C-alpha cells in the first residue's frame, strides 16, 4: 500500500540547541512502539506541536490508497482519495542519505534515514528492518496526525 514506515511518536525536546528559525522548530521525538529516534523540522507556525504530544507518523511513497505512483506535481483538483485525508499534517520531500552501522563485513543493524522536505530536514535513526523500505533519491510523503 506504498507505506514504508508507520509509528506512534512522542516528542520530548523543542530546539535543544536554541531557536534557529522562528517558523520552524527541530523536534527530537522518540517512538513508543519500537526503538526509533526521530529528528524532525515542522512548521509550528501553522501546526503547533507542544511538548509531550502523541502523534502517528507515517511515511508513504504515494498518498493514494490504491498505490498508483505520484508524478511529483501539484494537482489540488485531484478526485482520488488519499491517506492525507485522515491525517492533519502532510509534507512531501525526498531522502538524500541512508547510513547505518555496517562494517566492511557486517550488515547495518542501526540504520539512519536522512529525509529532506523542501529544506525541512528529517533524520530517522533506529533498527534496519523497519527502515528497510527507504532507498536513496526516492520521493516520500511525511504523514502525521496528532493523537490524544
Amino acid at each position: 500500500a506504498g507505506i514504508l514506515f508507520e509509528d506512534i511518536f512522542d516528542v520530548k525536546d523543542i530546539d535543544p540547541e536554541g531557536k534557529k528559525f522562528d517558523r520552524v522548530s527541530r523536534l527530537h521525538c522518540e517512538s513508543e512502539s519500537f526503538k526509533m529516534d526521530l529528528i524532525l523540522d515542522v512548521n509550528i507556525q501553522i501546526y503547533p506541536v507542544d511538548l509531550g504530544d502523541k502523534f502517528r507518523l507515517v511515511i508513504a511513497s504515494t498518498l493514494y490508497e490504491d498505490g498508483t505512483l505520484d508524478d511529483g506535481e501539484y494537482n489540488p483538483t485531484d478526485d482520488r482519495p488519499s491517506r492525507a485525508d485522515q491525517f492533519e499534517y502532510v509534507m512531501y520531500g525526498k531522502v538524500y542519505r541512508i547510513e547505518g552501522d555496517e562494517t566492511s563485513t557486517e550488515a547495518a543493524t542501526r540504520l539512519s534515514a536522512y529525509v529532506s522536505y523542501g529544506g525541512l530536514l528529517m533524520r530517522l535513526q533506529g533498527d534496519a528492518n523497519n527502515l528497510h523500505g527507504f532507498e536513496v533519491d526516492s520521493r516520500v510523503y511525511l504523514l502525521m496526525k496528532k493523537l490524544a
Partner: protein
Amino acid sequence: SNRPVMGIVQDTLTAVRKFTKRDVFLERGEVMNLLMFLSTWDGKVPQPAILKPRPLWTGKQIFSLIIPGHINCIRTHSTHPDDEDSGPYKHISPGDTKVVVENGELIMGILCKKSLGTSAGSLVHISYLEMGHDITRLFYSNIQ
C-alpha cells in the same frame, strides 16, 4: 584565477540568503508569481513541501527549479560552525548552514557569496563547467 569572474551581487545576494532560509514558506499565488520569472521552467508546478493544513512551498524548492539540470555541489555557508562537521547533526544541519545541491536540487543549505559569488567551486562555476555557457547565462538571469 580559474574561477568565475561574475557572480550574484548585492540585492540579489542578500535576498537569496533570506530566501533559502529554512523558515521561508510561500503561498500558492506567490509561487505562481515567482514561477513565471523562470525562463527555463518546464511549466510543471512542483508538489508543495507542505501539503496540509495549507499548501506551502519553500524557497529551496523554487531555487531547485532555478538550478539547471543535475549539477552537484557542496558549499559551506558563512555562519557555518566549524565543530558542526565533527559532532552529531553533521549532515542534518540545525543551522541550515551546509549547502548541498544534489541532482540540480538544493536539498538543504543557505546560499551566500561562498556558493553564488566569484569563488572557485561555487554553484555558478560548476554550472558553467558542466553545462556550457548559455545555460549558465540563463542561470544568472533566472536567479536575478
